[PDB]
RNA sequence: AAGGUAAGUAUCGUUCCA
């Protein structure tokens, strides 16, 4: 029973952030050779 | 990036789409400071003169013009939209999204390839054109 | 034309009769209309 | 009471997920009370692609299904439908499968 | 979970909204 609760404390901020981005008034969403040129 | 013409407010981009009939309007929505947007805003530099006959390139900062974010889904860092005679020309890539190129590429020939294909399919009067290359992978191996 | 202020009464988008698209449900904000 | 809290949170999460479903006003996706997302009619391809959710939404729905399963097992215990031994065995089966 | 939207032209219904 406890294992899924440690999984819960692990995933709580991920979902609390994804839902916050989703359920909000305003929504928000090979790179080194492009860096120094 | 900085060399290409820029649009500052919502009216200007709509006019730029409307003020042309015989070319294709290739608009790079995004942020010119983005590492992704700056990767392809130099490809669009290297071919701006070449495609002058059938393409005009305008740049738009979505923060400066927050009028098309919701309607055209401007939430990927970089977006490319093709317009012909005030009509968004859908293009079928290997990717699931068939309305935009939401990734910055590297080769100056493939972008001219895509622009010329869009022009060819738009003179006929289509709404969805088919790209030559398939972007369901990256051909890396 | 380039280098001109936006009209006061202009609708910022869709004034040219544009049609938006919804590729997926997650992307974008809520319709709220 | 804890079982009341579970029956409350199940309704709250079900309402959240139905709001997320009816966020773009796509009526061809329906969430049941067991947190299973089903189409009300056979999906045309345009509507199928138009109604798709990222891994985060599915993960939230499935963890809500897990907590709903636990709460409903406890309700079964409280309604005399199952024994305390049966409730414990069912809870162990839920948390082990 | 995807990488599987053909693009269109019609009348009709509805609804918010100006």
> What is the CATH T-level fold of the domain B2-136, as seen in this structure?
Glutaredoxin (3.40.30)
Count the residues in chain B. Answer: 141
- Determine contact, residues C20/D12, Cβ cutoff 8 Å: no
Method of determination is cryo-EM
Residue B130 parent element (H or E): strand B128-130
Q: Give helix D84-96 / helix D55-78 axis angle, nearest 10°.
A: 170
Distance in angstroms between the alpha carbons of the first and the last residue of chain B: 31
- Dist. CA B136–CA B107, nearest whole Å: 17
The CA-CA-CA angle for residues B86, B69, B27, to 5°, reads: 45
Q: Is the CB of C21 under 7 A from strand E?
A: yes
Q: Give helix D55-78 / helix D2-21 axis angle, nearest 10°.
A: 150
What is the DSSP-derived secondary structure letter of residue D3?
H
Beta bridge partners of D39: D29
Rounded to whole angstroms, the distance from the CA of residue B4 to the C1' of nucleotide E10 is: 42
Task: State both tokens at B49.
Answer: 């003169």
Burial zone of B29 (CB within 10 Å; 0-12 exposed, 13-18 middle, 19+ buried): buried
- Determine contact, residues D94/D70, Cβ cutoff 8 Å: yes
- The residues near B48 (Cβ < 8 Å, ≥ 6 apart) are B3, B4, B57
Burial zone of D68 (CB within 10 Å; 0-12 exposed, 13-18 middle, 19+ buried): buried
Residue D88 parent element (H or E): helix D84-96
- Dist. CA C25–CA B123, nearest whole Å: 33
Cα→Cα distances D4→B83, D66, D68, D75, Å: 57, 17, 12, 9
- Dist. CA D43–CA D49, nearest whole Å: 9
- Dist. CA B71–CA C28, nearest whole Å: 8
- Which residue of A lies nearest to D17 if distances are taken between CA atoms? A19
Burial zone of D40 (CB within 10 Å; 0-12 exposed, 13-18 middle, 19+ buried): exposed
- Determine contact, residues A15/D59, Cβ cutoff 8 Å: yes
**CA of C16 to nearest chain D CA: how many angstroms apart?**
24
- Cβ contacts of D20 on chain A, cutoff 8 Å: 22-23
Q: Please indicate if any CB of chain A lies within 8 Å of the CB of C23.
A: no
Cα→Cα distances B107→A37, B42, B115, Å: 15, 10, 13
Count the residues in chain D. Answer: 97
Count the residues in chain C. Answer: 33
């Amino acid at each position: 029973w406890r294992v899924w609760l440690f999984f819960m404390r692990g995933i709580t901020p991920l979902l609390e952030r994804w839902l916050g981005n989703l359920l909000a008034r305003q929504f928000e969403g090979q790179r080194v050779e492009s860096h120094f040129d | 990036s900085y060399m290409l013409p820029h649009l500052h407010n919502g009216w200007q981009v709509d006019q730029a789409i409307l003020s042309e009939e015989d070319r294709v309007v290739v608009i790079r929505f995004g942020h010119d400071w983005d590492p992704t947007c700056m990767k392809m805003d130099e490809v669009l530099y290297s071919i701006a003169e070449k495609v002058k006959n059938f393409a005009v390139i305008y740049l738009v900062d979505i923060t400066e013009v927050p009028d098309f974010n919701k309607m055209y889904e401007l939430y990927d860092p970089c977006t490319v939209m093709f317009f012909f005679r005030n009509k968004h020309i859908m293009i079928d890539l290997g990717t699931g999204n068939n309305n935009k190129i939401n990734w910055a590429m590297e080769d100056k020939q493939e972008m001219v390839d895509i622009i010329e294909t869009v022009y060819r399919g738009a003179r006929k009067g289509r709404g969805l054109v088919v790209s030559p290359k398939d972007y369901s992978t990256k051909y890396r191996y | 034309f380039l280098g001109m202020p936006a009209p006061l009464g202009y609708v910022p988008g869709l004034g040219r009769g544009a049609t938006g698209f919804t590729t997926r449900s997650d992307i974008g904000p809520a319709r709220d209309a | 009471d804890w079982v009341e809290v579970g029956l409350q949170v199940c309704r709250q999460g079900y309402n959240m997920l139905n709001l997320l479903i009816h966020r773009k006003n796509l009526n061809y996706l329906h969430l049941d009370y067991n947190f299973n997302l089903k189409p009300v009619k056979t999906l045309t391809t345009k509507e199928r692609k138009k109604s798709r959710f990222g891994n985060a939404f599915h993960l939230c729905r499935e963890v809500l299904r897990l907590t709903k399963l636990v709460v409903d097992s406890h309700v079964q215990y409280r309604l005399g439908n199952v024994d305390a031994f049966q409730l414990a065995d069912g809870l162990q089966y839920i948390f082990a499968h």
